[PDB]
């Protein structure tokens, strides 16, 4: 949104870059930060941890009723069966979308997100626009922003991550996918479907 008091994006980036490099130089001299530590953290969240992990959990639940029960009973323990878990996903609670209920997650207080299954959150999830509105006008937000129309008669449950409990949405399995392999089903599971802002891919 327009703000006549705000500097250009270019000037803002130039200022931040200098401030970060300055702080970095100090933490490096203190011996608590190194270039290898920076590269390792970035490598993990750029190529290792991402929404493909959550998709594996979703498709297993879709094709294994017993695992699905375990997943809904204790998200952390169930995901550990697939070697999935860790930082910012120590406590996970999965919620199941049905014909009567639709779930959507948010962190109104900051940006809390289940990193182990979805990787780092996209910028819109961390921004004030989505966070402020989703708990107040979830139906309108889903339609206007994501083109997702949830019938007035269908309940929308918004989960606000105020604690370390991380909420993840188990989207409904799209119709016309009878007998599909876990790999084929995975192509339908998106990061958005696990946040609850969109259903899993149709067809």
């Amino acid at each position: 949104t327009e703000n006549i008091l705000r500097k250009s994006d270019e000037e803002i980036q130039k200022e931040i870059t200098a401030r970060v490099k300055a702080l970095e130089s100090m933490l490096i001299e203190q011996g608590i930060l190194t270039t290898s530590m920076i590269d390792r953290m970035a490598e993990i969240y750029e190529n290792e941890v991402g929404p493909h992990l959550g998709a594996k959990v979703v498709v297993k639940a879709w094709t294994d009723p017993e695992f699905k029960k375990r997943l809904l009973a204790d998200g952390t323990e169930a995901c550990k069966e697939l070697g999935i878990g860790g930082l910012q996903g120590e406590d996970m609670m999965w919620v199941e979308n049905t014909d009567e209920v639709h779930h959507v997650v948010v962190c109104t207080l900051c940006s809390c997100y289940p990193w182990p299954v979805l990787g780092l959150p996209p910028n819109w999830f961390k921004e004030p626009q989505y966070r402020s509105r989703v708990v107040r006008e979830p139906r309108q937000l889903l339609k206007e922003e994501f083109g997702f129309e949830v019938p007035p008669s269908k309940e929308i449950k918004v989960w606000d991550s105020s604690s370390e409990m991380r909420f993840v949405v188990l989207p409904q399995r799209p119709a016309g996918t009878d007998g599909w392999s876990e790999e084929e089903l995975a192509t339908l599971v998106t990061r958005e479907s696990m946040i609850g802002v969109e259903p899993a891919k149709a067809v």
Binding site: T1, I12, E15, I16, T17, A18, R19, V20, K21, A22, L23, E24, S25, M26, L27, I28, E29, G31, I32, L33, T34, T35, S36, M37, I38, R40, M41, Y45, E46, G85, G86, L87, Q88, G89, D91, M93, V106, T108, L109, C110, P122, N123, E127, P128, Q129, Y130, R131, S132, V135, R136, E137, R139, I156, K157, W159, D160, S161, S162, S163, E164
Partner: protein, 228 residues
């Protein structure tokens, strides 16, 4: 604190800015900002709750429109100064140095295998906040409770939109680090945690969606019994 950061329910923030796709890190400084999280944590700058509090104390105008990772930088500086680990004057001098010489080298340093070990352990092992306490849970599923109207000036996870509101306990998760003490440098002091369901009508009045509910996590001191 009643900070602007507590945006749940705030009107007028504008339409969502959402590109079709984006990189995990939009610039090199973001990778550095991100990596400083486990670095400052290990160094004792702060815990997770204190990390959040540092961001909550930001200039609201700066918070609302600055790139996300800049919030992280602000909390590092906040706690670095608080603990005396960061000299502000030296930081300002170095900032100007890098403004004038952006390609100047970073300080010579030795790599440390222990820091990589910490990264791997924190990432894959996690930093669990669950704790065991001697007291049993005061509440249980089905209990109708009311959220506290207390307004601490320090850190807390008491979104203004749920204060004084009545809801139903959905699940008891066990005990966890208590924000009201942890975020204010007063220790873990674990408390039982509960997910509570609040109807949209309860939260927003007639303007609320007639078929929606918000689930919000409440530590034990946050709620009091209405109907068992």
């Amino acid at each position: 604190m009643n900070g602007v950061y507590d945006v749940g329910g705030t009107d007028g923030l504008g339409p969502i800015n959402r590109p079709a796709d984006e990189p995990v890190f939009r610039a090199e400084w973001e990778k550095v900002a991100f990596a400083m999280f486990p670095a400052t944590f290990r160094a004792g700058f702060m815990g997770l709750d204190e990390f959040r509090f540092g961001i909550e104390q930001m200039n609201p105008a700066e918070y609302l429109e600055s790139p996300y990772y800049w919030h992280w930088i602000r909390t590092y500086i906040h706690h670095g100064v608080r603990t005396g680990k960061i000299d502000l004057e030296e930081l300002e001098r170095r900032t100007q140095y890098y403004r004038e010489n952006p390609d100047a080298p970073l300080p010579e340093h030795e790599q440390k295998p222990e820091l990589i070990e910490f990264v791997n352990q924190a990432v894959y092992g996690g930093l669990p906040a669950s704790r065991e306490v001697d007291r049993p849970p005061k509440f249980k599923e089905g209990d109708v409770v009311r959220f506290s109207t207390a307004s601490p000036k320090g850190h807390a996870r008491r979104a203004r939109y749920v204060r004084g509101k009545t809801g139903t306990v959905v699940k008891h998760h066990g005990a966890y680090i208590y924000p009201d003490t942890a975020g204010n440098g007063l220790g873990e002091c674990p408390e039982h945690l509960y997910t509570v369901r609040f109807t949209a009508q309860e939260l927003w009045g007639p303007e609320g969606d007639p078929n929606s509910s918000v689930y919000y996590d409440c530590w034990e001191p946050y709620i009091e019994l209405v109907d068992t």
